[PDB]
Amino acid sequence: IVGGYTCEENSLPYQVSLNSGSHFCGGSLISEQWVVSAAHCYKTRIQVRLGEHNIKVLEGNEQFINAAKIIRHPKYNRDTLDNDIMLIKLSSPAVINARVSTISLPTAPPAAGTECLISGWGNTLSFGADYPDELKCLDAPVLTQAECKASYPGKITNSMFCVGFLEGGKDSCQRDAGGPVVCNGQLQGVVSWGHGCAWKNRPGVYTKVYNYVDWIKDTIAANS
């Protein structure tokens, strides 16, 4: 997250880190056994890390659980990034407490101007690299679809929306992919892609979670 702030330590019990070799993507806990992330984060061997604020210090609330099933959207396209969403089923259920808890699936579509919270352990710099131990947060509004398409001509599919600022300086970045965009107490977005990070007229592009609520519910039910 470029241009954000350090998140309060007890405030994002739904944020997860995906770890295989390194911390490589984020995600969101949506039920005791299931996490939502980006299809481009797919790997076969994933440890899901719950209850974290600082990815380098044990605070006492960590639960690190292997991924048993990893299910990319059945119409994911890696060349366009269409349908960039995935589900992970944990090998054991998470234990729900103050620091490990679920984020609600959306019950209405996201509208332009709605204020959201984007979070992750991604790069904090547009110049060079500084990957933070503590989780970062960005307050950002949903942009108009017209602004989104004008920023990325011919690249915005039905699965995608833009959240952030056309002025540069405030955006998600590398290592943030898969992580949450939360608006009105519900998961509306998954961090996906952008041209650079926090560059002028290149807002972040996010997967519109509201389009997949039935897929998520059906997938969970079929893999129970």
Binding site: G21, S22, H23, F24, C25, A38, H40, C41, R78, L81, G122, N123, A129, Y131, S172, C173, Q174, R175, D176, A177, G178, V191, S192, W193, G194, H195, C197, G204
Partner: protein, 54 residues
């Protein structure tokens, strides 16, 4: 050329996948953060792989 004499590309995707690339100036393979999509062929899973090609 495509494998060894083009500079590293992060790409548009926002994961952080550690990859290796050959830097002609340095004469070695070096780690970089790959975003997860697009990018170019100077992009190896290991140092060994990278040196063998380059």
């Amino acid at each position: 050329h495509d494998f060894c004499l083009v500079s590293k590309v992060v790409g548009r995707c926002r994961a952080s996948m550690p990859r290796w690339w050959y830097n002609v100036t340095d004469g070695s393979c070096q780690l970089f953060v790959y975003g997860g999509c697009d990018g170019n062929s100077n992009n190896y899973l290991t140092k060994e792989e990278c040196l063998k090609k380059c």
